[PDB]
Design a protein around this ligand. Structure first.
Ligand SMILES: O=C(O)[C@@](O)(COP(=O)(O)O)[C@H](O)[C@H](O)COP(=O)(O)O
Ligand SMILES: O=C(O)[C@@](O)(COP(=O)(O)O)[C@H](O)[C@H](O)COP(=O)(O)O
Ligand SMILES: O=C(O)[C@@](O)(COP(=O)(O)O)[C@H](O)[C@H](O)COP(=O)(O)O
Ligand SMILES: [Mg+2]
Ligand SMILES: [Mg+2]
Ligand SMILES: [Mg+2]
Ligand SMILES: [Mg+2]
Lengths: 140, 465, 465, 228, 356, 140
């Protein structure tokens, strides 16, 4: 029997329970966005704004249901409307991570028919982050 | 044309095969088995009459109103291939017949009395055409698929749930203990079992509080939004509301309701409350199979599903196809569309008798639950896509290493299949390989795969098309 | 015993043929049709497990509680004579499993999921033993037969009612018109049709007001207490209550609810409101035949009737035996006793699987309604006795001389039969003579007897014992 | 089809002369007087845009949603006989644009801003097609003609009313006095003048009470139902 | 005053130009919930006009994307964003979902910038009960400001809402949707100055005043006149500005004028010159239409406004040197440069209908 | 396209979006105060009291609407009533910044007819402040 560690084992929603994505695996996800005609977009946030929190609720009456701070991240430029080139997306990842090397950065895509984000995953965490485990150390 | 006392055939007034349906009419498709020596026309006409304006003998009060304007109409009768004494009778009900916003009233007319008639042997409501003009009178689901995903900040994969077990008998503290351990391993949701309400072994408010602690601990630990469907199902509306109020005051995301055992009137009330206070509402379909299992008699689930969508619910159980409970593949795909989509075309090979226009009413998230485990993951992702919630009760609390590893196993399997589909792999055919690759990689998953490898649920399907 | 992961047979834990039932246990009798190659024992065990404490694989959390204390138990399996693949499986549920005062919760456990199991082809709940210890947790019916008769000042005969027709399409003024004319001819009650709620052609508050005027006019004219079951059935609990409130504020005696289409949660709320404000509550069983018509699958009406008695109602429709809707004689006599009496003995020839002790909870008044007329009167008095309400919608509003003479005819027939029975005449054999003697004497009755003389409802019975 | 910042003609997106109106669409007929050198097509398209989804320059957020689904549509332009510079511009609004049961919201979209545009000289809303699917979202009139007649027990003739005069200045007692004398003569109704609310010369609750007395006196006198 | 007389057969046309509301009548009104002085004090904002922005497209955005657009606009330097006048509660976005996501956006932007932020949440609804429910939710979220369409909602609802705002400390932004149905034509209707006086009495912290230079009609002199009537305590009779009567407001708080509708960075000098600091300047398309997104769009408007403010404070004449000030700020701010490039040739010059 | 940075880009109300004010530009603003007869005043705050915050709302019911801590700063001496000398204001800026070299300091002015602060801008930030960007690094 192995025990799932509660210490410094924060996750990041979709795909964070898999081994870290290789460049080839990120590229295949981008192909999937393009093949489906979805709108690619990058978002980023500094370390303190990366995880869901409650601070604003101090100002609330009894209305905190489904309210969390840090759901919104900062948009990198604009959603790439009409983009059919995977290389264009990959270049924007490089550009975004170059400008903000100490930020959390995630790639997302939007469907405009349903009007909802239809996919998303983390592409960069700061190298100073200590709150996560490598796959083989998630249980002990 | 005066008042003439006495009995005459229903078909004289209620069988109108030349009638052109109106875009505002409610349409019903009944599977009808008449008694020997009762013509299909008269049987369909009886069903139309006694679910709209007529009774067994002529009444004088007809003259005071306009039967033409209000009467239900059997406008078409279809033979059923392979059956000597079974027909699809189509009935059209003018919009004036129904109370705005009331599934209760719609059910009271259309399925109220006709199923008990001596003149028929069996009757089944297969489908309903709810016209846009009527759909617009309903508040509908509190949030729906898009808003839910937006509030939970979850995209790009199916949601993962889990029913705490044993069904009954656990104390509030242990309930919270089981909830914390399941959520912290990668499940988005856990839930009260449908019959967990308030009982001697566990009172509801004790549970709600410990569960809140568990939710907030798991959330802090994982940095992902977590929830637990707290059951508001109760004996009275007052009790139901008290429980919803407490959830609201704990700031938790989601509650649940058993809409058939609680009822449509209670459920609408709860949906409206959930709308006004920003709670997600998970709907359990307890009792549905009493109504919808048999091919010859009852109401098909797709109608019960339509009814729920109108009444209000952000989630509704859809069946699994592959688990412990019945649900045929094509029929399921048909009502999943009716639950989720804005517009669904007539498609008799999936049981869809009518084109259904939902006129922008939010979609309901299907919930696949009951007897599923990790090896079912590929099939589940392939049937439902991302817009679904997949629940592993036994498939989590039955893991040899406990709830947290159990959850991680399910989470790994879901994400592995999702990644594989996104890369262009066929989950219908490469499903086993995807799971096996993940096994050699994740020990938690390996342990789950080993324990449930030989477990299948393959029986002859009762509810056929 | 330690925790051992993996699937095992339900029968190892949930088939207990040597169990001695407790006097506080809820008992259930399931008509069970298993799939080929599923032993009856394992099938009955699955039903017991999945309606109480178990799921499809072993869970570690069992060890934290006491399965012995909480588990449902299949304790007996009975072969069905004449059937190769049908069984009566008896299940015992400990009282701890249920929420006090909640029919919703009882239904959620006992009939929640088990009917949809792949391992069975069909399932029907035939009967429930509700123990006194559980019965006492329910407020029950607002008044009951004794108190109702006392408040209405009516004794020594059946009560007479009438559903206004056409079902839908009448205006509020014409509704009251019809109500006044029916009440003034000798009917005690009239009623909203089950699907008359609030609609474009007639809004509820308009109807309530005009009907009140009609009730008070008829009462002043005849010198007898009069009522009209005003329908509180609605889309939401809030709407239902507003309608209840209006009736209270009009000072009228009686309202109604469609308990299955509205729901148990709403129904219990209304029953408690009626208790606290002194309104009689008439219960309509709209939708019941969707659930209770077929012998092989569903829930028998006797259970739906027990459930209603616990949830609360002063009246409940019981069927007519002789009218347009199905109801076998012996079975009907059985559940009528279950609705009315304090103590009913096990009696398999009437479908009573369990001795039922109601521990002083008031009796519910049976309502015979649906395709009856003056010639049925002898058979009706013979079946039900005085403690029943007999309802003639078409049988009143279909009279050739209008509602008043229609009511007078029904009143005369009822009273003639009641007199004859009191005098020692056998209504089973002298029925026709009593009606004929009353015909030659009452012209209103004669006109009714002429019109409906040849009208009978005789079809092969679907729901057999 | 990317994001391209800048101003462009409304007609490119909002003039759709081939559009087939839906049975759930709200339809408006505008009497339109455009400025000199503003084409009717562009003027109708501006009215359609600025009363539905559009503004004066292209916005990137359009791509997040589906303009095809939400945009108002100028679908037909009719010349006005006898007028050089007047047109009837027909606009279609998808039912999604409106709040259920709110005349306020419908007015806010359809007549909210467009009447003040510099590019037109005058604008008149002539008619609206309220589709059944939208009509059903309204509670509507408390009773209406049939129910009213039924409650008042009045049939077979027009109803007769009367406004108390002078408009303002009368005391509550005198108001009730004039009400009684008017009702008892054969009028079914009397009424407060539109501007009679509550004022220094007559407070509303005083009036209601004396009027009640007048109503009930006239009713008992004539044997006919009376109201004010 | 306007009940029946306009429908008389004996006249061809009638227009109410002005009302003299005497102090003895003004005193019977609760009036605006807070007014210009109190508003600045609660927001902690002084020495420049306020900047706002209407989210676009008007309708069709989901609640999440609504908040997304709100966040990105607010963080770039705008003080306020707003629901479009016809954004209430609809199939594509229900009001409570919007309120919550917007609150998240307000608080994110505020923490990021260190400046107080707000978003006019629309309480306009079908019924008073619905309106109040929306106001209650805003109160319970602790947000600074809500909005109401006072003409399409109506004066009775508006006065109710204004009193509620007073009693609970919410700022109330008034949209004048429908006014031009009433006030556009010179021969018939009611002049805006009267609709503006009415609003001040009924209650509003903000009221739209027109832009003079943007896409909607507003003659300069007439606008300067009613802006004074909205803001000041005492306004003298002045026929050249359409003021028929001396108006004494007897200390009733002033209403903040809101200039909105087809304005962009080049209009900034003219806007600051017409209104001065006590106004709100709103750029919907002028922010969401920027080639680089909402944040740079907001930064461009903020830079333009502050540049013009600085110039005016230094003694520069914004009527003449306006173009130079903007160009100097362009060569310095790339956000502003991008905005100036896109809208350089864009003007709204048509013949004025409502003349004196 | 350039991206407006969310990281350490705090502002300070009026004039903070412009290039830092030169001594000549500060002097011109002071002249504007004097020319209009407004009352100059200086206010100051330590780093922790500089930006709007919510800590007091923990003591509230549902009444946090338009309540923020740290709107009030600490007054330097008194408002300079009847001041008709721009040099007098400038010398007070020097004295105030000398006494509190590690404080945020702002110059404000009051109009007594409207009874409201009619202008204001920051004149000093602590040299240890790391939560702001220079004009040319505000976008990346
Ligand atoms: O009680 C149960 O059996 C479950 O909690 C599943 O438990 P497991 O995950 O342990 O199997 C669900 O309520 C059923 O899935 C309901 O059936 P359906 O979804 O068909 O309505
Ligand atoms: O709608 C009807 O058909 C009735 O009003 C009877 O009308 P008539 O008197 O004109 O036949 C009753 O609702 C049925 O009796 C219900 O059936 P049950 O009592 O078996 O539940
Ligand atoms: O709907 C609109 O057009 C606006 O949001 C402006 O949008 P843009 O900023 O994108 O132009 C405003 O409501 C109008 O200014 C109202 O007119 P007014 O102020 O004259 O009442
Ligand atoms: Mg369950
Ligand atoms: Mg009926
Ligand atoms: Mg008048
Ligand atoms: Mg707008």
């Amino acid at each position: 029997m192995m025990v799932w560690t509660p210490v410094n084992n924060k996750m990041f929603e979709t795909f964070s329970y898999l081994p870290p994505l290789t460049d080839e695996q990120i590229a295949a996800q981008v192909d999937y966005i393009v093949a489906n005609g979805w709108i690619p977009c990058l978002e980023f946030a500094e370390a303190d704004k990366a995880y869901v929190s409650n601070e604003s609720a101090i100002r609330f009456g009894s209305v905190s249901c489904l309210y969390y701070d840090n759901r919104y991240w900062t948009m990198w430029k604009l959603p790439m409307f009409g983009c059919r080139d995977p290389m264009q997306v990959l270049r924007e990842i490089v550009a975004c991570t170059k400008a903000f090397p100490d930020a959390y950065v995630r790639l997302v895509a939007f469907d405009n028919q349903k009007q909802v984000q239809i996919m998303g995953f983390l592409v960069q965490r700061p190298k100073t982050a200590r709150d996560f485990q490598p796959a083989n150390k998630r249980s002990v | 044309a005066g008042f003439k006392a006495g009995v005459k055939d229903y078909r004289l007034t209620y069988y109108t095969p030349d009638y052109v349906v109106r875009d505002t009419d409610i349409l019903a498709a009944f599977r009808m088995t008449p008694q020997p020596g009762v013509p299909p026309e008269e049987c369909g006409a009886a069903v139309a009459a006694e679910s709209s304006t007529g009774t067994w003998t002529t009444v004088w009060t007809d003259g005071l109103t306009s039967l033409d304007r209000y009467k239900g109409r059997c406008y078409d009768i279809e033979p059923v291939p392979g059956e000597d004494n079974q027909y699809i009778a189509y009935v059209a009900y003018p919009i004036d017949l129904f109370e705005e916003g009331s599934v209760t009233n719609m059910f009271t007319s259309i399925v109220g009395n006709v199923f008990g008639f001596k003149a028929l042997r069996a009757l089944r409501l297969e489908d309903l055409r709810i016209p846009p003009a009527y759909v617009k009178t309903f508040v509908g689901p509190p949030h729906g698929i898009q808003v839910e995903r937006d509030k939970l900040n979850k995209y790009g994969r199916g949601l993962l749930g889990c029913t705490i077990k044993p069904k009954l008998g656990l104390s509030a503290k242990n309930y919270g203990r089981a909830v914390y351990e399941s959520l912290r391993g990668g499940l988005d949701f856990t839930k009260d079992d449908e019959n967990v309400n308030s009982q001697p072994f566990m009172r509801w408010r004790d549970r709600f509080l410990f569960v809140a602690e568990a939710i907030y601990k798991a959330q802090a630990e994982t940095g992902e939004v977590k929830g637990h469907y707290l059951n508001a199902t109760a004996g009275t509306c007052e009790e139901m509301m008290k429980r919803a109020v407490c959830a609201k005051e704990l700031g938790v995301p989601i509650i649940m309701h058993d809409y058939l055992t609680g009822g449509f009137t209670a459920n609408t009330s709860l949906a409206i409350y959930c709308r006004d206070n920003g709670l997600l509402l998970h709907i359990h379909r307890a009792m549905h199979a009493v109504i919808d299992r048999q091919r010859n008699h009852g109401i098909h689930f797709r109608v019960l599903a339509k009814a729920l969508r109108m009444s209000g619910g952000d989630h509704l159980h859809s069946g699994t196809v592959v688990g412990k409970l019945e649900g045929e593949r094509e029929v399921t795909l048909g009502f999943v569309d009716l639950m989720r989509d804005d517009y669904v075309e007539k498609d008799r090979s999936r049981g869809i008798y009518f084109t259904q226009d939902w006129c922008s009413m939010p979609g309901v998230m299907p919930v696949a639950s009951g007897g599923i485990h990790v090896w079912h993951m590929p099939a589940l992702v392939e049937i439902f896509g991302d817009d679904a919630c997949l629940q592993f009760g036994g498939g989590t609390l039955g893991h040899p290493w406990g709830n947290a590893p159990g959850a991680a196993a399910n989470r790994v399997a879901l994400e592995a299949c999702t990644q594989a589909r996104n890369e262009g792999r066929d989950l219908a055919r490469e499903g086993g390989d995807v799971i096996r690759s993940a096994c050699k990689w994740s020990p938690e998953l390996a342990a789950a795969c080993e324990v449930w490898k030989e477990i299948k649920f393959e029986f002859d399907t009762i509810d056929k098309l």
